[PDB]
Design a protein around this nucleic acid. Sequence first.
DNA 1: GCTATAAACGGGCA
DNA 2: TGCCCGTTTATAGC
Length: 183
Amino acid sequence: KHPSGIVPTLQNIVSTVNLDCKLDLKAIALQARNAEYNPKRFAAVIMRIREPKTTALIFASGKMVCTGAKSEDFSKMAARKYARIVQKLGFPAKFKDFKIQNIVGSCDVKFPIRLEGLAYSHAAFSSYEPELFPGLIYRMKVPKIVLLIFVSGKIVITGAKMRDETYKAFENIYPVLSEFRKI
DNA sequence: GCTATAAACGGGCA
DNA sequence: TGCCCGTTTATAGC
């Protein structure tokens, strides 16, 4: 599955779930010692839990965004704990349309990269302006994934809805990275 | 921390 | 409309 012998580590998962019931955000902010609520700044109650370590953004619509988990399973579990906390605050919340929205991964190929040469040979997919950001932004089309490539050989892979896309994008880029290994 | 990346969410504003 | 508003996370030069 990983011909490269390297498996990108999952670092952050963004998911959403529909609690399916309108929410009184001021009421949640009061009853919960866990919550943070600043309406003029953002229309959401910000809640956090230690295990799995995540941050939830809860809206009046009943929609909820779960961030920070290390896996899809962890992200769903976390979203479930938030749903229960809300149910317990006195809201008839369900757990409708749970959906993984973004998976962020990273790995180390353990060799330096000639970013400029790589960008020049893949102009249609590359954005490299070292004065603004030290990483080369590689917008792959298949799968539709963005990789941030650094001189150190460290790689960030983001935009995936399924972990296999994270893996395929890395496998696709591996031989390109090797071709432009800084010697 | 600022710079940049992806994604979801909502209120506010030109 | 189409932005930024928020939060998360790896990464690194400023």
